[PDB]
Amino acid sequence: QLQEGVKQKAILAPQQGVTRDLKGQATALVVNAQNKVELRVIKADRVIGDKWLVTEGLNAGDKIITEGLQFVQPGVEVKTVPAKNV
Amino acid sequence: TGKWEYGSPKLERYNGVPAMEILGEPAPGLSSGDAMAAVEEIVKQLPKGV
Amino acid sequence: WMFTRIPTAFLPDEDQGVLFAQVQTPPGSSAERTQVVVDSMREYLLEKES
16 A cells, blocks of 8 residues: 555545546536626546545646536526535 | 436327327416317427437 | 307316325436425424415
């Protein structure tokens, strides 16, 4: 069980935030300070426990959608309530 | 090596050719033949081969 | 001009006794997210709808 490195100040997104599209890349619906939903290009490959260990697009402070990826399309003003599932 | 794709989880056919099914409802207070006419009017824009 | 007005129906609306509540979680969901939706719907339809 040899250790192969730490990633200092990493980002962990759940499966509910990271869904994929027709081209083969990964997407993640984030919100802004303007309270609009925005689709940015996330890059996730490794699953630790359950959370994706991402390397691109998301920094500290963003808020990803985890309930309601069907009711919400990118461009809709939303209100934020914290999650009910992990 | 792995690669993610995007495919359909239910492919259905109809008389030997593939299709997709809808479940339509008429307007409240309107006849069913009126809704059938108003939903066969929409088929005048589908691509050549559908 | 009284029979022209009213809409046509195939069968009247009946108090059959059952109701269907089919759900669809967002794509890429496991079974336990569907069960968390289902059992919460179940305890709502039994606790406040006794």
